[PDB]
Amino acid sequence: MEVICKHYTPLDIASQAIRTCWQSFEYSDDGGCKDKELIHRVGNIFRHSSTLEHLYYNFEIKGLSRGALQELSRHRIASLSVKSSRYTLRELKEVESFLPLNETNLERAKEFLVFVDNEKVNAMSVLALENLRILLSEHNIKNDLAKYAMPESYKTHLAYSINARSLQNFLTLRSSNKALKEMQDLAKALFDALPGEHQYLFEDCLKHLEHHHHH
Amino acid sequence: MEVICKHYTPLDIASQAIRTCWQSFEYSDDGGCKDKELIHRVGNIFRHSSTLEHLYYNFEIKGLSRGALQELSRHRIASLSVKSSRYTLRELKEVESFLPLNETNLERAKEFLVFVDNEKVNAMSVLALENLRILLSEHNIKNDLAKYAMPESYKTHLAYSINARSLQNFLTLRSSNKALKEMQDLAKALFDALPGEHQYLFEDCLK
Amino acid sequence: MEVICKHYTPLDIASQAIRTCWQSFEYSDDGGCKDKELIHRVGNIFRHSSTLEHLYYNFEIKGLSRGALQELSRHRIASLSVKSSRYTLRELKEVESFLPLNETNLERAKEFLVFVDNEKVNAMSVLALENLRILLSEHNIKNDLAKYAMPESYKTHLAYSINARSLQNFLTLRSSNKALKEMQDLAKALFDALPGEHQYLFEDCLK
Amino acid sequence: MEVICKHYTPLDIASQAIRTCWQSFEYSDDGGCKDKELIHRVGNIFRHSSTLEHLYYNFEIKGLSRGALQELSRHRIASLSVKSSRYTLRELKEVESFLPLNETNLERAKEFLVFVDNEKVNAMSVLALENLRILLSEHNIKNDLAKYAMPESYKTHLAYSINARSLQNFLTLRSSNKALKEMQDLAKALFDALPGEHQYLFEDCLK
Ligand SMILES: Cc1cc2nc3c(=O)[nH]c(=O)nc-3n(C[C@H](O)[C@H](O)[C@H](O)COP(=O)(O)OP(=O)(O)OC[C@H]3O[C@@H](n4cnc5c(N)ncnc54)[C@H](O)[C@@H]3O)c2cc1C
Ligand SMILES: Cc1cc2nc3c(=O)[nH]c(=O)nc-3n(C[C@H](O)[C@H](O)[C@H](O)COP(=O)(O)OP(=O)(O)OC[C@H]3O[C@@H](n4cnc5c(N)ncnc54)[C@H](O)[C@@H]3O)c2cc1C
Ligand SMILES: Cc1cc2nc3c(=O)[nH]c(=O)nc-3n(C[C@H](O)[C@H](O)[C@H](O)COP(=O)(O)OP(=O)(O)OC[C@H]3O[C@@H](n4cnc5c(N)ncnc54)[C@H](O)[C@@H]3O)c2cc1C
Ligand SMILES: Cc1cc2nc3c(=O)[nH]c(=O)nc-3n(C[C@H](O)[C@H](O)[C@H](O)COP(=O)(O)OP(=O)(O)OC[C@H]3O[C@@H](n4cnc5c(N)ncnc54)[C@H](O)[C@@H]3O)c2cc1C
Ligand SMILES: O=c1ccn([C@H]2C[C@H](O)[C@@H](COP(=O)(O)O)O2)c(=O)[nH]1
Ligand SMILES: O=c1ccn([C@H]2C[C@H](O)[C@@H](COP(=O)(O)O)O2)c(=O)[nH]1
Ligand SMILES: O=c1ccn([C@H]2C[C@H](O)[C@@H](COP(=O)(O)O)O2)c(=O)[nH]1
Ligand SMILES: O=c1ccn([C@H]2C[C@H](O)[C@@H](COP(=O)(O)O)O2)c(=O)[nH]1
């Protein structure tokens, strides 16, 4: 799994919005430590958390399992353009069988499958991958029908955009130890992809200081 | 699949809302044909389609594939509580093998899988189902790990709540022949599950 | 201000929804006290908050000031149909002057204005109300223009619908002492209008 | 009224998003003629219009009326941070009267009021402004109470963010001849503040 932050809204956009409520520009730093500190003090007060919505982040996500896509898509206050299995499963036509399950076929399978910490499941996923490319390549069955045999370990790719407020929500919900392992990884990857200057607005989301049982 | 409308907002909620913008209550016929056509007429003037949002429908959907869930979840202006593979895959631990593919095992497999119009794909789905069961039952692997080998054709179950405005959007987009067959079927099942008196509001959005 | 709950989703709906997640129906008592206990329990766990969304409330709000409407419409996850000033200001076309500010007039003025806890501002509102009446009655000036001289204490009427999850968020924010006094009343009024058994889902929001 | 686009998402963020769906990266020309044509073509196909949501526009709106704020706040798929009358009304505590009304005092009133195409209604606004000032100055009454005598023509200031998809919707709904004049102006203004490169994505929405 690889996550990249393709674009982000400059920090002061948020400080400029906050001061607009109280008309306290006279105390503006134009992006100085005072303004930055303001976004964190006001932006984190629930009644005024909406101020962080002005901050947007354009990410790219590679290698996420479709099973994890099921969960990512539930965060409805965000935008995504996802690789369609309906429009792209043909990618398995000109591909060699993944069986027998030898050392080099397993590695080849990783291009299309997300492996987890259990050799047997990974094996089964590859068996599902093989049967899938058999339907698509050897019997030219259409994507719309063949997709039904595809394992959720199958890899997806997506462009993902989300504002700061919704992102704190995502990180709080997914960095939690109650979330699927892969999703916890997505959460961290997202945070890490974030520009150093903005991370202070999301750090406490990985700490769970209000509900510590999540770590 | 199976869809049932467990509850819906009475039509007069929307006609009363509409008449509030203009305070045109004197024209109300108490939830009669006038108020009914008012909902459809004003509800279709784009600048006032929000008025339809007051209408809410609570559905129960049984038999939808995970692959179809993947698409349904993309309609954001809606609420849903879905059966979790992370919390319910232990349902395969003590079940009988799905192989061979005799009639009783295929019937049992249909309780867990959606079959499409291709005998080979379904055979494959049943094979993926069996491996999933084997991972869960004998190798006793935990849900968070085994769910990765689960085939998207696995059946899901969920409660689905959406308002009239978001529903028209769904029916329009998913009844299109551009949509996945299962989704087209979903749109139709959603429509057929709607109380008769309300269908006139969504009829124009179907097909 | 007056608030009325015209319709609401039955409780067992969120009850049936939560159980769909774990497929724990055998434990259900058909909306009983055990299922009712469930809604509040799981409903308060943040990762399952979404289960409260299946519950929808259809309210009618009378007498709210436009100044408060300014704040209420900022809650984006709700639906509303509001009396339009652009479309209904002629309601003043045929009304007798509100001056002098005697007591019988201060009373009539209340039919169109929200009075607060201060005689002087209320007086200014009537004067503003009177000047608005003049623009509309004597000079017959269009609504789109005359509306600019309307005091924010002018009353509005609206159909308001919102789900449990968003309502909790509302009651919590607007019942705070940090909230404009009128909004605090609105929160209390929405809570009081709720059917008996639904009120436990929102009780703590007022603390 | 003044509008400034403080920041925006580069176009290829959208073309990269679209291409991700079909994995058609090979035909990309890195935000060139091809990718631009792609946004306009795919981005306007309803089933794929969500691809435009990736473009975000950060604006600044100066001198908009509260009457207009009332309608602007109804577009819930957008973000806004608005000047608060509850926190900033004391700005009238040190201003001289606007009475008697005269070329000089009217001019001064424009600093706090939005004027319209009707001198009588503008005059009535200043009179409303004078009373609001009095409540705040002469009697030092709290903003929460005084604000009730404020005319909807009072000026506001806010930071406004919204994505391409929601913006097309807004421009279509507000540039319309059915919308209040000021909103038509805000629509035109927002569109003009956009960078030329992005205007071809909104031109058909406007007029
Ligand atoms: C550990 C874990 C376990 C889960 N288990 C299940 C499960 O078993 N079954 C299941 O179906 N889902 C499950 N989910 C999905 C989860 O319930 C939803 O993703 C979540 O409820 C959406 O809420 P959100 O806050 O993430 O909203 P987002 O959509 O990510 O963000 C929107 C925010 O806006 C508000 N909002 C948005 N839409 C609405 C609305 N329609 N009504 C009211 N407020 C709204 C909310 O306050 C929300 O926080 C689980 C998630 C986690 C992290
Ligand atoms: C035939 C078909 C093919 C598809 N192919 C792909 C594909 O290849 N890749 C892919 O990633 N997706 C694909 N999708 C997903 C689809 O693009 C999204 O589900 C859809 O765009 C979300 O828009 P909606 O109108 O369904 O919104 P819903 O979420 O169902 O409803 C919300 C409505 O509110 C508005 N709205 C909601 N959220 C926002 C927001 N964040 N910004 C602005 N306005 C908003 C919109 O006007 C929208 O119509 C496909 C869908 C269909 C029907
Ligand atoms: C005491 C008080 C003081 C206030 N002062 C000001 C002020 O000075 N200036 C001002 O402009 N406003 C002010 N407001 C308005 C307030 O900021 C908004 O009403 C509020 O931000 C809307 O947020 P919400 O959580 O109530 O969302 P709702 O719109 O009521 O509900 C939606 C929920 O979904 C989520 N959500 C919705 N939309 C988005 C989005 N676009 N991005 C991310 N998450 C989203 C949120 O988590 C939210 O809780 C004040 C409100 C109060 C109660
Ligand atoms: C000329 C004109 C006249 C008007 N007259 C009145 C009037 O008399 N009374 C009155 O009360 N209002 C009136 N309005 C307000 C208007 O009806 C609302 O602002 C509007 O309906 C909100 O819809 P939207 O498309 O602007 O949504 P936005 O909130 O701007 O954008 C969100 C988009 O997402 C979708 N969406 C968002 N929320 C929901 C939801 N809860 N359910 C379903 N889909 C959703 C929609 O497709 C919508 O287009 C008027 C507006 C105009 C332009
Ligand atoms: O950690 C979780 C568990 C469930 N879900 C939601 C989204 C899917 O629609 C459904 C998936 O359930 P699982 O297959 O992840 O168990 O419920 C999540 O978003 N995150
Ligand atoms: O008809 C479609 C095609 C794609 N998608 C969206 C939602 C999923 O996140 C992803 C699924 O692509 P498919 O697996 O359906 O091809 O894109 C749909 O909703 N409907
Ligand atoms: O308690 C408050 C204070 C401000 N606002 C938002 C919504 C309006 O757009 C604007 C109103 O500022 P006031 O007129 O309430 O001061 O900011 C609220 O919603 N609630
Ligand atoms: O052109 C209009 C007419 C009405 N409204 C909505 C939003 C406000 O809540 C209420 C305002 O009615 P007017 O004051 O604009 O007449 O209805 C608009 O957004 N735009």
Write out the DSSP string of C134-182: HHHHTS---HHHHGGG-BTTBEEEEEEEEEHHHHHHHHHHHSSTTS-HH
CB C56 within 8 A of CB C14: no
Look up residue D69 and give its two tokens: 């704020």
Report the residue from B47, B173, B178 with minimal CB separation from D173. B47
Of A21, A48, A42, nearest to D88 by C-alpha is A21
Beta-strand pair A2-8/B2-8: unpaired
Q: How far apart are CA A116 and CA A134, in angstroms?
A: 24
Q: Is the dihedral of CA A158, A164, A165, A168 positive or negative?
A: positive
Order of strands across the sheet with A2-8? A2-8, A56-65, A155-163, A79-82
Give kind and range of the element (H or E) at residue C21.
Answer: helix C12-22
Cβ neighbours of residue C105 closer than 8 Å, sequence gap 6 or more? C98, C99, C126
Q: In this complex, do A121 and B86 lie within 8 Å of one another by their Cβ atoms? A: no
DSSP letter (8 states) at residue A134:
I
Order of strands across the sheet with B2-8? B2-8, B56-65, B155-163, B79-82
CB A64 within 8 A of CB A70: no
Pocket of ligand 3 (CB under 6 A): A 21, 47-48, 50, 53, 77, 163, 165-166; C 74-77, 166, 169, 173, 178-179; D 79-82, 84, 87
Q: How far apart are CA D202 and CA D204, in angstroms?
A: 6
CB A20 within 8 A of CB A72: no
Chains touching D (at least 3 CB pairs under 8 A) are A, B, C
Cα angle B178-B182-B185, degrees, rounded to a multiple of 5: 90
One-letter amino acid at B37 equals E
Of C99, C16, C110, nearest to C63 by C-alpha is C110
Question: D25 to chain A, minimum CA–CA distance in Å?
Answer: 12
Q: Is D108 on the interface with A (CB under 8 A)?
A: no
Q: How many residues in chain C?
A: 207
Cα angle A39-C71-C164, degrees, rounded to a multiple of 5: 90
Q: How many CB atoms lie within 10 A of CB D196?
A: 6
One-letter amino acid at A191 equals F
CB C189 within 8 A of CB C68: no
Look up residue A135 and give its two tokens: 């339907």
Q: How far apart are CA D76 and CA D74, in angstroms?
A: 6
Q: In this complex, do C135 and D124 lie within 8 Å of one another by their Cβ atoms? A: yes
Q: Is B73 on the interface with A (CB under 8 A)?
A: yes
Q: How far apart are CA C41 and CA C35, in angstroms?
A: 10
Q: Is C114 on the interface with D (CB under 8 A)?
A: yes
CA C70 → CA A95, C67, C73, D130, distances in Å? Answer: 60, 5, 6, 22
Q: How far apart are CA B132 and CA C180, in angstroms?
A: 57
CA B162 → CA B5, B159, C54, C104, distances in Å? Answer: 11, 10, 8, 49
* Angle between the N-to-C axes of helices B33-43 and B12-22, in degrees from 0 to 180, rounded to the nearest 10: 70
CB D56 within 8 A of CB D163: yes
Q: How many CB atoms lie within 10 A of CB A194?
A: 21
Residues from chain A that touch B127, judged by Cβ atoms under 8 A, are 127-128, 131
Beta-strand pair C2-8/B155-163: unpaired
Q: With helix as H, strand as E and coil as C, how does chain B read? A: CEEEEEEECCCHHHHHHHHHHHCCHHHCCCCCHHHHHHHHHHHCCHHHHHHHHHCEEEEEEEEEEHHHHHHHCCCCCCEEEECCHHHHHHHHCCCCCCCCCCHHHHHHHCCCECCCCCHHHHHHHHHHHHHHHHHHHCCCCCHHHHHHHCECCEEEEEEEEEEHHHHHHHHHHHCCCCCCHHHHHHHHHHHHHCCHHHHHHCHHHCC
CATH code, residues A1-215: 3.30.1360.170
Give kind and range of the element (H or E) at residue A167.
Answer: helix A164-174
- Residue of D77, D81, D158 with the most ligand 3 atoms within 8 Å of its CB, for mutation: D81
CB A143 within 8 A of CB A40: no
Q: How far apart are CA B73 and CA A65, in angstroms?
A: 16
- Rounded to a whole number of angstroms, the distance between the first and last alpha carbons of chain D is 18
What is D111-153 written as a DSSP string?
TTB---S-HHHHHHHHHHHHHHHHHHTTT---HHHHGGG-BTT
Q: How far apart are CA C142 and CA D36, in angstroms?
A: 45
Give kind and range of the element (H or E) at residue A4.
Answer: strand A2-8
Of C104, C130, C125, nearest to C113 by C-alpha is C125
Q: How far apart are CA C174 and CA C121, in angstroms?
A: 23
Determine whether A99 is exposed, middle or buried from the number of CB atoms within 10 Å of its CB (0-12, 13-18, 19+). Answer: middle
Token pair 């607005």 is found at A201
Give kind and range of the element (H or E) at residue D160.
Answer: strand D155-163
Beta-strand pair D56-65/C155-163: unpaired
Cβ neighbours of residue D139 closer than 8 Å, sequence gap 6 or more? C120
Q: In this complex, do A84 and D161 lie within 8 Å of one another by their Cβ atoms? A: no
One-letter amino acid at D62 equals K
Q: How far apart are CA C15 and CA C43, in angstroms?
A: 10
Look up residue A81 and give its two tokens: 């353009």
Instruction: Please tell me the number of the ligand nearest to residue A174's CA.
Output: 1
Determine whether A62 is exposed, middle or buried from the number of CB atoms within 10 Å of its CB (0-12, 13-18, 19+). Answer: middle
Cβ neighbours of residue D51 closer than 8 Å, sequence gap 6 or more? A81, D14, D17, D18, D21, D39, D42, D43
User: What helix, strand, coil percent values describe chain C, rounded to 5?
Assistant: 55, 15, 30
Q: Is the CB of B82 under 6 A from ligand 5?
A: yes
Q: In this complex, do C121 and D150 lie within 8 Å of one another by their Cβ atoms? A: no
**Residue B105 CA, distance from chain mean position:** 27
Q: Is the dihedral of CA C48, C53, C54, C55 positive or negative?
A: positive
Q: Is B13 on the interface with C (CB under 8 A)?
A: yes
* Angle between the N-to-C axes of helices A12-22 and A33-43, in degrees from 0 to 180, rounded to the nearest 10: 70
In chain C, how many H helices and how many E strands?
9, 4
Token pair 């139709």 is found at B188
* Residue D86 annotated as lining a ligand binding site: yes
* Per-residue b or e along B102-125, where b marks 16 or more CB atoms closer than 10 Å to that residue's CB: eeebbebbeebbbbbebebbbebb
Look up residue A155 and give its two tokens: 């890899």
Q: Is the CB of C173 under 6 A from ligand 7?
A: no
Provide Rg for chain B, Cα atoms.
21
Helix/strand/coil for C98: coil
Q: Is D174 on the interface with C (CB under 8 A)?
A: no
Q: Is D5 on the interface with A (CB under 8 A)?
A: no
Chains touching C (at least 3 CB pairs under 8 A) are A, B, D
Of D157, D190, D152, D182, nearest to D62 by C-alpha is D157
Residue B72 alpha carbon, nearest atom of ligand 6: 19
Residue D158 alpha carbon, nearest atom of ligand 7: 9
Give kind and range of the element (H or E) at residue C59.
Answer: strand C56-65
Q: How far apart are CA C44 and CA C30, in angstroms?
A: 21
Determine whether C170 is exposed, middle or buried from the number of CB atoms within 10 Å of its CB (0-12, 13-18, 19+). Answer: buried
CB B16 within 8 A of CB B54: no
Question: C172 to chain A, minimum CA–CA distance in Å?
Answer: 10
Q: Is the CB of C121 under 6 A from ligand 1?
A: no
* Per-residue b or e along D117-142, where b marks 16 or more CB atoms closer than 10 Å to that residue's CB: ebebbbbbbbbbbbbbbbbbbeeebb
φ/ψ bin of A23: left (φ > 0), alpha (ψ from -120 to 50), beta (otherwise): left
- Rounded to a whole number of angstroms, the distance between the first and last alpha carbons of chain B is 19
Cβ neighbours of residue D71 closer than 8 Å, sequence gap 6 or more? D179, D180, D183
Q: How far apart are CA B82 and CA C21, in angstroms?
A: 5
Look up residue A140 and give its two tokens: 């030219």
Tell me the sheet residues that pair with D59.
Answer: D5, D160
Of B142, B42, B130, nearest to B86 by C-alpha is B142
Q: Is the dihedral of CA A74, A76, A79, A84 positive or negative?
A: positive
Q: How many CB atoms lie within 10 A of CB C90?
A: 13
Q: How far apart are CA C11 and CA C52, in angstroms?
A: 10
Q: How far apart are CA C127 and CA C122, in angstroms?
A: 9
Cβ neighbours of residue D203 closer than 8 Å, sequence gap 6 or more? none
CB C195 within 8 A of CB C160: no
Of D135, D136, D127, nearest to D99 by C-alpha is D127
Q: Which of A47, A54, A62, A85 to mutate to test the interface with D (most CBs of D within 10 A)?
A: A54
Look up residue C15 and give its two tokens: 């009850």
How many alpha carbons lie under 13 Å from residue A30 in its C-beta half-sphere?
A: 0
Q: How far apart are CA A75 and CA D97, in angstroms?
A: 53
Of B30, B25, B22, nearest to B48 by C-alpha is B22
Q: How many CB atoms lie within 10 A of CB D107?
A: 11
Task: Select the CATH number that applies to the domain covering C1-207 from these four: 3.20.10.10, 3.30.1360.170, 3.40.50.300, 1.20.1250.20.
Answer: 3.30.1360.170
Q: Is the CB of A80 under 6 A from ligand 2?
A: yes
Residues from chain C that touch D128, judged by Cβ atoms under 8 A, are 124, 127-128, 131, 149, 151
One-letter amino acid at A204 equals D
CA C151 → CA C175, D36, D115, distances in Å? Answer: 25, 48, 15
Order of strands across the sheet with C79-82? C2-8, C56-65, C155-163, C79-82
Q: In this complex, do B23 and C88 lie within 8 Å of one another by their Cβ atoms? A: yes
Residues from chain B that touch D168, judged by Cβ atoms under 8 A, are none
Which ranges of chain D does DSSP label H, i.e. alpha helix? 12-22, 33-42, 66-72, 85-88, 103-109, 119-136, 143-146, 164-174, 181-193, 196-199
Helix/strand/coil for D100: coil
Look up residue B151 and give its two tokens: 């085939």
Q: How many CB atoms lie within 10 A of CB D90?
A: 13
CB C54 within 8 A of CB C13: yes
As annotated, the active-site residues of A are: 174
Give kind and range of the element (H or E) at residue D57.
Answer: strand D56-65
**Residue D200 CA, distance from chain mean position:** 20
Q: How many CB atoms lie within 10 A of CB B27?
A: 10
Helix/strand/coil for A24: coil
CA C121 → CA A75, C182, D51, distances in Å? Answer: 46, 15, 50
Nearest CA in chain D to A162: D54
- Residue of C66, C76, C79, C82 with the most ligand 8 atoms within 8 Å of its CB, for mutation: C82
* Residue A73 annotated as lining a ligand binding site: yes
CB C59 within 8 A of CB C186: no
DSSP letter (8 states) at residue C197:
G
Q: How far is the CA of A140 from the centre of ligand 2 (A)?
A: 30
**Residue C151 CA, distance from chain mean position:** 19
φ/ψ bin of C107: left (φ > 0), alpha (ψ from -120 to 50), beta (otherwise): alpha
Q: Is A132 on the interface with B (CB under 8 A)?
A: yes
Q: Is the CB of A179 under 6 A from ligand 1?
A: yes
Q: How far apart are CA B97 and CA B100, in angstroms?
A: 8
Determine whether A145 is exposed, middle or buried from the number of CB atoms within 10 Å of its CB (0-12, 13-18, 19+). Answer: middle
Q: Where are the domains of chain D?
A: 1-207
Give kind and range of the element (H or E) at residue C6.
Answer: strand C2-8
Q: How far apart are CA D129 and CA D126, in angstroms?
A: 5
Give kind and range of the element (H or E) at residue C33.
Answer: helix C33-44
Provide Rg for chain D, Cα atoms.
21
